[PDB]
Amino acid sequence: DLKASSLRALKLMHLATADTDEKVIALCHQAKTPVGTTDAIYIYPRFIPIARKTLKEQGTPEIRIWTSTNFPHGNDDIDIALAETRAAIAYGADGVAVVFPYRALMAGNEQVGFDLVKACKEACAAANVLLSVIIETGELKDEALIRKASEISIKAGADHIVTSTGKVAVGATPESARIMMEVIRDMGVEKTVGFIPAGGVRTAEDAQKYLAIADELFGADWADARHYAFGASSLLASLLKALGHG
Fold this sequence. Notes:
By secondary structure, this protein is an alpha/beta fold.
């Protein structure tokens, strides 16, 4: 079970560094692993052009490039999140992860998170770029708030919902992952919305647990690269070790 889960998780990784052009070049090389490529890399927007050229030159132009906007703070200024999203698109992103305005939701504002996600989804869809939304489960903390942010993000057009930025102490848990996937299931949007646990997903055993929740709720074929990803860095070494590499 663990070897199989590990190859599966490797192929679904959005590989991040655990910030310079040299380190991003090294990240691109690391994404071309002995057992296959990760799905993507995840980097700050300014590094997209050099990463694209590196991926092309090593013969893996299929590896996608994700970046983040409104990040990591999840502020509630839509004009700033939209300008950063348009810049990320112009740098060449294949996907943008925008941080949801979670503190505004906690204060009672449901509308601003709908409007901010919808504005960024509009820009991304016009450029054929995917939009994921990071809700910051470790700050929202309560199940009802995690459900509400997931719901609002989906209604506003999120292509994926993501637990965490990796910039606050608490990232994904099995419990917050199950709550967010339950929202996808209950809203019936599993064909159009994926899920990404991120922040603190360190081991092969952690990745197997997240994939086991997806397989239970959606059936084992659901968690393809359009519908699932892992936001992780050092996880790659743990997956490779599980497979007998390094």
